[PDB]
Structure 1
């Protein structure tokens, strides 16, 4: 009769069903472990979250759970089970049990050089999942290599819907946020450029520095690029800077597929109104060997929070989380 499991200090109370726990990753208010499921006889992923001390985290937790419960797609992580205390008073932690993936794009690009065909295949799958997300009228807002999970057969699944909506990792952040579905396309362009070189394309240290990196490759902005209700400090700064020449894609990425760079160019478009859309991305020549619109499903209906979660006190959100996960409790 073994007690509570433990990984790197903190307790994982996942009972007799889930054992053999092993560290695989972490977040701002939780940790993800692999575990042996003694019912399905496979290893699974278990995401522990402890968000109740903060309203923002309770929001993120509830959003993710709701979205993932609803969503059903081959390239998006699902939820198989949820564990928490039998009463709300003892609920200090929530455990989301999910399909175990082998690794993520972050770690893979750390150790491995991708061939053009695998770059092409990963990008196809990113866009195939994103299409579904966007068809549901949801924005992911935090697309980046560590939120892309992979298995042995090169299948890919998008994870971490905490920031998702009907403040994020700066390197992959669209320019307009620092100055809509188009923000997710920018992030995907950033990811594509990273698969092509194994390095982040715009590794900025803070918001203005982030804009500086983007402009150091795209060149100084046109007036039409800039006229868009920008923050006054940013606009004053951007106007102050010396001219920057555009660096040609084929010079940043010397051995890259020419079709890949054409799509890159269309994703990394400064003006969000000019930037390529997910369905258009899928239909670009570069993805042609994989493009199959009868095998790229959309969500059954757009997603909707009928409660305005932003205004809700964290005690109310905790009650909602208790209610949302009741369906998984014994009985």
Structure 2
């Protein structure tokens, strides 16, 4: 078995010629050659069994990604884990290999207005499907937006996905709602326009300050909803902040792109634009095609209350969910 950065990757004999992609808290992504399909694939190693929260994420992503089928959403082609539950410490999720991600692309490339428009369309087409299944992604960021050589976009990382970095987090998450994904897509749109994050806060306080520095001081109506007391008081203790017009921050940006940006980056989630209205925005006219925008057959529903389940039980559910990919099923 191969070793990638002192981490073992037990995916052989089928998957070999491993190469590092990235890593998180309890997982590592590599690329490898599939000796059956004769292509390179992406493999995601997960070690979640010590924590209940990590077990919940793993099971949700596996369940959601195996039911969904849409061009702009990553699937699961294969899953590797030990023959027995006692020996299963890791789960390897095999997925389509893409050329890069938006995080990497925005670090080296300046995007044309037509490419910002096209990438934005595919995010919203993907999210149109997700939201139609009554699911929120809850963690849309440039690293979760995969791109291939022909500019096809796929949304990955459904660990935080639920049935309806802090830089892409909606203010209502920071002040205690498919609207949270729209906020993230708004942040991503702004980063595509300038190659830098619009709200790069070092901490939540710095995050809220970055937000108010552009949007201006929140209105009474915006501070009317259920809000955390510490957060509400903090905002009430701040000196007035003026709203910075969108053309001052993005002088070169397409005004239609700035109209949609404004509607997505709305403090009040109840006043924020929805996915379908965003797809119909004049800015996405050249790509908008409701004939070619699939929705889910029925809303996604989990059979069990996963949050209440002990980590040992979640492991069993994971073992059963992953059984269909084992030889002799």
- Measured against the shorter chain, the TM-score band is over 0.9
- Cα shift at 1:299: 0.7
Q: Deviations over 1:147-199 (max 9, x none)?
A: 1000000000000000000x993100000111110000000000000000000
* 1:72/1:37 CA distance change after superposition, 3 Å: same
For residue 94 of structure 2, give the secondary structure of its aligned residue in structure 1.
Answer: strand
* 1:169/1:128 CA distance change after superposition, 3 Å: same
Pairs within 5 Å for 1:10-25: 10-25=7-22
For residue 271 of structure 2, give the secondary structure of its aligned residue in structure 1.
Answer: coil
- Cα shift at 1:208: 2.1
For residue 287 of structure 2, give the secondary structure of its aligned residue in structure 1.
Answer: coil
* 1:66 equivalent in structure 2: 63
* 1:178 equivalent in structure 2: 174
- Cα shift at 1:300: 1.0
- Cα shift at 1:209: 1.8
* 2:100 equivalent in structure 1: 103
* 1:276/1:168 CA distance change after superposition, 3 Å: closer
> d(CA) in 2 for partners of 1:127 and 1:28?
28
Q: Deviations over 1:13-44 (max 9, x none)?
A: 11210000000111110101000000000000
> d(CA) in 2 for partners of 1:206 and 1:55?
26
Assess if the C-alpha contact under 8 Å between 2:135 and 2:164 holds in 1.
no
Q: TM-score, normalised by structure 1?
A: 0.98
> d(CA) in 2 for partners of 1:318 and 1:233?
38
1:304 and 2:301 aligned? yes
Q: Deviations over 1:276-308 (max 9, x none)?
A: 000000000000000000100001110011211
> d(CA) in 1 for partners of 2:3 and 2:74?
25
* 1:134 equivalent in structure 2: 131
> d(CA) in 2 for partners of 1:209 and 1:309?
34
For residue 172 of structure 1, give the secondary structure of its aligned residue in structure 2.
Answer: coil
> d(CA) in 2 for partners of 1:229 and 1:93?
40
Assess if the C-alpha contact under 8 Å between 1:21 and 1:35 holds in 2.
yes
Q: Deviations over 1:61-104 (max 9, x none)?
A: 00000000000000000000011111001101101101001110
Assess if the C-alpha contact under 8 Å between 2:45 and 2:90 holds in 1.
yes
Assess if the C-alpha contact under 8 Å between 2:164 and 2:178 holds in 1.
no
> d(CA) in 2 for partners of 1:12 and 1:213?
41
> d(CA) in 2 for partners of 1:11 and 1:207?
36
* 1:313 equivalent in structure 2: 310
Which structure 2 segments of 5+ residues have no match? none
For residue 57 of structure 1, give the secondary structure of its aligned residue in structure 2.
Answer: helix
Provide the aligned C-alpha RMSD in A. Answer: 1.4
Q: Which moved more, 1:192-201 or 1:24-33?
A: 24-33
> d(CA) in 2 for partners of 1:48 and 1:89?
18
Assess if the C-alpha contact under 8 Å between 1:17 and 1:37 holds in 2.
yes
For residue 162 of structure 1, give the secondary structure of its aligned residue in structure 2.
Answer: coil
Runs (4 or more) in structure 1 with deviation over 6 Å come to: none
Assess if the C-alpha contact under 8 Å between 2:263 and 2:272 holds in 1.
yes
Which structure 1 segments of 5+ residues have no match? none
Assess if the C-alpha contact under 8 Å between 1:142 and 1:168 holds in 2.
no
Assess if the C-alpha contact under 8 Å between 1:141 and 1:168 holds in 2.
no
> d(CA) in 2 for partners of 1:228 and 1:50?
39
